[PDB]
Structure formats: C-alpha cells, structure tokens
Design a protein around this ligand. Sequence first.
Ligand SMILES: NC(=O)c1ccc[n+]([C@@H]2O[C@H](COP(=O)([O-])OP(=O)(O)OC[C@H]3O[C@@H](n4cnc5c(N)ncnc54)[C@H](O)[C@@H]3O)[C@@H](O)[C@H]2O)c1
Ligand code: FES
Ligand SMILES: [K+]
Ligand SMILES: [Mg+2]
Ligand SMILES: [Mg+2]
Ligand SMILES: [Mg+2]
Ligand SMILES: [Mg+2]
Ligand SMILES: [Mg+2]
Ligand SMILES: [Mg+2]
Ligand SMILES: [Mg+2]
Ligand SMILES: [Mg+2]
Ligand SMILES: [Mg+2]
Lengths: 46, 70, 86, 108, 161, 96
Amino acid sequence: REVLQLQEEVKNFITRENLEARVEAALDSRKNYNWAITREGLVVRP
Amino acid sequence: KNVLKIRRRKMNHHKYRKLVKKTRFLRRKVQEGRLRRKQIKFEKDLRRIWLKAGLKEAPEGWQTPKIYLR
Amino acid sequence: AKHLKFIARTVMVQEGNVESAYRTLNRILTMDGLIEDIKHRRYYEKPCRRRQRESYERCRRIYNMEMARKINFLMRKNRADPWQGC
Amino acid sequence: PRYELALILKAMQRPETAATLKRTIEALMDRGAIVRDLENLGERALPYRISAHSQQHNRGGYFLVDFYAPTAAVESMVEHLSRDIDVIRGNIVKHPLTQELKECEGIV
Amino acid sequence: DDPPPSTLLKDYQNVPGIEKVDDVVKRLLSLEMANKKEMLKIKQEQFMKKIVANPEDTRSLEARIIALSVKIRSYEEHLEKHRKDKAHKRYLLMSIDQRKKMLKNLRNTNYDVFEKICWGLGIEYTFPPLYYRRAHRRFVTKKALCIRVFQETQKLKKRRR
Amino acid sequence: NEDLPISMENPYKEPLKKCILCGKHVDYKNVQLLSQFVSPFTGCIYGRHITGLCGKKQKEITKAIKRAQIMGFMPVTYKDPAYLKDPKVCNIRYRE
RNA sequence: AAACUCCAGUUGACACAAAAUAGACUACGAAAGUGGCUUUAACAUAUCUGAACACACAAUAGCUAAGACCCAAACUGGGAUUAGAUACCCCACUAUGCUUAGCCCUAAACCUCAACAGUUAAAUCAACAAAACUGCUCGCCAGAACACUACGAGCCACAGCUUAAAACUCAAA
Ligand SMILES: NC(=O)c1ccc[n+]([C@@H]2O[C@H](COP(=O)([O-])OP(=O)(O)OC[C@H]3O[C@@H](n4cnc5c(N)ncnc54)[C@H](O)[C@@H]3O)[C@@H](O)[C@H]2O)c1
Ligand code: FES
Ligand SMILES: [K+]
Ligand SMILES: [Mg+2]
Ligand SMILES: [Mg+2]
Ligand SMILES: [Mg+2]
Ligand SMILES: [Mg+2]
Ligand SMILES: [Mg+2]
Ligand SMILES: [Mg+2]
Ligand SMILES: [Mg+2]
Ligand SMILES: [Mg+2]
Ligand SMILES: [Mg+2]
C-alpha cells in the first residue's frame, strides 16, 4: 500500500520540465496553515 | 557531623602549606639530590644485572637513559 | 530593537485616567514576571543560589496550597452545634 | 530523508520572485533533491526587521519547498542559501509530516 | 565496503512488483534517501546471510556478535570525524569489550561458528593479558636491558661452544 | 451461588480527561495557534498552570514557538496584533 | 568624594560574550554535567558481580601555546569610612570566565543510601536521618591524635596529585 501510494504521489512531483509552470502556479496560489483552538477543544478555521 | 574534625583538617592543612612556603628552597635541593641518588641507584641495579650475567661491560650500544630528570 | 514600537507593554488611557493606565501596566508587568526579573537582574545570582531559591519557592507553594485545601475541606464542619448539651 | 525548506524571500516583483524560486529549486535538484511540491504562504510583514546582504527588510515572501534529499545535501544547501542575495532567510527542517503523531490516553 | 546507494531499503526489498516501479520511486526507496541506520541494517543483513546458518534467527550469539560489530564500525566511523566525542569513545570501548566477551563464549561453546564469525567479520581474536600493572619508565628500561643482556649472553655462549 | 460478585474492570470508569490540544498537530507555521499561549503585552510563553495544557503538548507548543520566533514567523516581544481577537483559552485576567 | 564631560537622551547600523518567559516541567547522560534555533552522526551488553594502580572519562580553580574581548572579576591603583582597614561601600582595570591544540586529575565530585535479586512477614525499630529486612558479590573499616603528615614508589604534575606509616603522648576521642 505504501509503495502504491508513493507511486501515485510521484506523478505530481516537480521535475525539470514542469518547473516553470509549477513555479508560476504556486506564485498564483496561497496556502494557509493558521487555525485557532477554542476552550471546548474545537478548531476554528480562518 | 564532626565539625571539629573538619576544622582540625583545615588547621593542619593550613599549617602544612605555611611550612612548605617557608622552606620551599631547601625542599627543592633535597628533592634534586634525592633524584640524583635514585638515578644512581637505578644505574647500579642495571650494572649489577649485566655484571651478574657475565658481560664485563654494558650491552653494545646501550646507554642508561635519565628517566627521572625533568 | 528590531521590533515594531508601541505594541509591546503598551496601554491606552481611557477618558484621561492616566493613573489607572499606569496601575494596569504595573499589574501586567508584575503578572508576566517582568518586574521581578528586572529586580533580580540588578545583581548576579549564583547558579546554586538560584536552584535553592527555585526549589524553596516550589515547595513553599505546594505546601501552602495543600494546607489551604485541608483548611477548606475541614471548614464544612464549622457550623452550629446540632447536639448541644449532649 | 524528507525535508521542508522555509524560505523568506525579498519583496520583489513577480519575474524576480519566479527566477529566485527556479534558481533555488534548481540548486536543490543539482544537489540530488526530488522536489515534491512548492507552496506559497504569501507576502507579509516580517515579525521583525531582518538585516541580510547589507540590506534591511521589513516585508517578505514566505514559501515552502517540500523535498527528499540525501543527508549530505542539507548542509550544502544551507551554504547556498547563505549566498543567495534574494533570500532573506532560509531554514531546512525535517518535514513535520514524517514526525509521528503518538496518541495520548489523557492526564494521568 | 558500504552497500551501493542504489540498494533498496531492507523493508522495501521483498515487496511484490518493486522492480516494476518508476526510477524516482526506486531512488526514494533506496539507501541514497535514507539515514545511516538503514545502511547499517543492510550491512547487518548481508553479514547474516554470509555467515550464520539461519539468517532469520537474531537470537543466536553469532547474530548478536554481527550486530555489535556493525555498531562498532559505526562508532569508529563517527569517531574518525568526531575525535573529541568522549561519550562515543566510551561507547566504542564498551561495545568492543562486550564483543570480546561474546566471542569468548562462542569459542567456548561452538568453535566452528567461532571460526566462521572470525573469518567473515575480519575479527582477530586475542587472549587477555594475564596481569594488569603499569609499565612505567624504570620497568620498561630495565626489561629492555635484560633482553639485550640475554641476547649478548646467547651470542657469547655460541662463541664459546 | 449465582449472586456472588464477579471480577470485572470498572464499567463506570469515566474517560480520562483530555487537554484542549490532545490529538491535534502543533506546527511552527501555525502562528495563530501558537499566539494563543503567549502574553499579549510581553510575548512571554504562558506556563501550564495558565494554559491548562498537558506536559507533552506544553513542550510541543514551547518548541514550536521558539522555532517560529527564530525562523522569522512569530514576533518575540509581543503577540501579533492580528491575533488579539482570537478565542481566549488561557486562565489569566489583567482586569484590562 | 572620586571618575567622565571624545559626556548624556532619541533614532539607525552593529559579537569568537550570555542563552528572559516556557520550567509551578523533573527529562537526558556512567558520573562530571546538560535548559536559544536548524541539520548530520548518535546514547554498549537478552545472566549478575568484577580494579587507588589496567582502559577510558571527570565541575570550578590552575599551567603551557596562539586568538577573541561586551560584561563580570582574584590582584592592583584612586575616593570615602575607621583609633587603624593591606576589608566591607564607589570608580577604573588585569590574570581568569570564551575559542583552538595540549596538560593538571582535585570538590560538602553528597540522595553524605556500593552493584544485582527478593520480601512486606515478624519484636517494625538504640537515636536521628530516609519504613524494616533478606540472599549474593566486590570495595573498605578495627581507640584518639600524630596524619589530606614523614619516607618509599608512580605520575606532562616540580610550593603538585595518588598510595600512605612509625616513634613520643593520652584515657579517652
Ligand atoms: N594483580 C593482577 O594482575 C590480577 C590478575 C588476575 C586477577 N586479579 C584479581 O584481581 C583481584 C585484586 O587483586 P589485588 O588485590 O592483588 O590487586 P591490587 O588492588 O592490590 O593492585 C595491585 C595490582 O593488581 C591490579 N588489580 C587490582 N585490582 C584488579 C583486578 N580486579 N583485576 C586485575 N588486576 C587488578 C592493579 O592494577 C595492580 O597492578 C584479585 O581477586 C585477583 O584475583 C588480579
Ligand atoms: S492530554 Fe493527551 S496530548 Fe495532552
Ligand atoms: K549534598
Ligand atoms: Mg560489569
Ligand atoms: Mg585492590
Ligand atoms: Mg578537569
Ligand atoms: Mg582554563
Ligand atoms: Mg554535583
Ligand atoms: Mg561496585
Ligand atoms: Mg570498588
Ligand atoms: Mg587510629
Ligand atoms: Mg602528600
């Protein structure tokens, strides 16, 4: 299972061919890792 | 615990360190003379060995090193 | 030095009550440990003395909380005597 | 192993930022890295003023580069990140996902 | 010699179809993309296959000797670079003593396996010294003189006879 | 006798108490979460008697805060003003 | 009072020093020790015991070479106090605390509890400390002082460290 998962994941890795397009797409994207916790133990997503 | 024993150890040690300071120069001469005599004794023991073995002199090329002189 | 100014340790005054703002700032600095840190940093505290002091305060706090708990637990029995006379 | 490079890049225009990202990923690959994905966290004010390459920065672009590299590569990459003038601050860490989320039974 | 960096990890070597995967997956599942511990595991497996009768039994004295030998090699490699690491020097010396004890037990119990272990791991078994006493300057010089005097006495006796 | 008691683990045993972050991943990039355990005015990390966190998660939060602070993700001398209106999870009041 | 006034306040740039808060945690390491961040190596042994000397280590202080120098500071000066101050208080500044390569091998180096295994039954148990014991092994001890001493031996140590007595004296310690 791990090997198959890695094999399917490798299809989306950055190579020397897609470096331009992937860099451009990443520059046109925003990732957010911020999230808060409440006194009840719940996650509040921004 | 014995605080008298530790205070006695302190007084004995402090008195001793005063004595060595006062007689530091006389002690050095005694130590160097003792080292000279000890080297002489070591050489005499080595000579005893090669004399008892049968050799009239030391082994060819042998020189008794000075193992105690700083 | 490399941080933005007027954000840290800053209190705004309400309706010209400057004394209240100062006392609130003092409470904040004392609660966050800054005041005692400044007072302790005036002279060097030796590591052994620091360890002894920290152990002493920790054990003092533990003992005081335990005694308070005991007194609060035994305070329930302090009511009017229900079997007075006998 | 798996590593995450947190990159704080100079506040530049889109072409220079793209060129810097390409150069960084190319160096990673030259040192033997397999780059998994590139995330953009955004351009934001730095938590504090940072002095790098005889320039003071108050704002910067935050990027994440996930990759697989040999253990010997990391040191080399660090030195490279020290020379790049468009990098305010680069830090390579072991990828947080590889760290195992051990389970807890609660307060004993 | 270390295993080649292209070698697969010990846990990813018997997976079915592992030869039918892409080159990138092969690189990711190789020693090149792993810490030194997986590479030491590969050395241990290779030594087990080369030496012991049952490579699966890790409980035998020979298997423990092989594992400790790999650990000792790792410690020596660490100490070549880290000359002032006293803790790792202690660990190396302790592991060497433990391996000597295990080798003594193996020699006392199974001499054939002892010989196989000694040949395979390149270990030259040495018997412990009978006495533990300081060889200070006086003793060393005196012993050298005594050896020289014995040599000269032998020469003189040969000449006489 | 069928009415005799039987050996058994306590069926009424209440589930052991959990900290608010139990089962959740603490990451150095999540400045919003790490800012909930620092003083708004000084940025000092709150102790476990204030945060209410367990020892393991207290250590995790401390390490994440230090990593974020040194890597240029979190301010040191104050809490980021953007996170001043987040839910309050620490048992501390300045009467402010 | 001396000292500085090339002084002081804000702002900006700016360490070979030290590592608030977390830590009210009690973890890692054989001990010594270890509390800023990242990464690489990495924390011996599936019987136990096993050394003043063998093999490795050992806080602080100290000795050689080079380097760094913010702050602190034996020593050394100046100011003040005092009957006097060769101290305490104030100012300044060294060796030293730091890095590199070697030494030195000492601590109230103490949990003042030797290592492993086992028991909670007996009168538990001189006292105090830290509940009382058992099996097995190594190390050590046989009145006080002389004595962390003398001599001998060993040592990169030379006013040093380890081991370590005897004579005279006393009825105690
Ligand atoms: N002296 C030896 O070389 C030696 C050789 C084999 C066994 N042992 C054993 O070690 C024990 C201690 O003997 P000791 O009192 O006469 O020595 P010791 O303590 O009186 O010292 C004298 C010499 O013996 C050495 N020594 C001390 N302890 C030792 C040990 N455990 N093992 C080996 N050498 C040691 C020392 O290095 C020293 O050179 C004894 O049980 C003995 O049987 C000693
Ligand atoms: S109580 Fe489970 S992680 Fe804190
Ligand atoms: K103690
Ligand atoms: Mg042992
Ligand atoms: Mg002995
Ligand atoms: Mg030392
Ligand atoms: Mg020094
Ligand atoms: Mg200690
Ligand atoms: Mg022992
Ligand atoms: Mg012993
Ligand atoms: Mg006596
Ligand atoms: Mg002596």
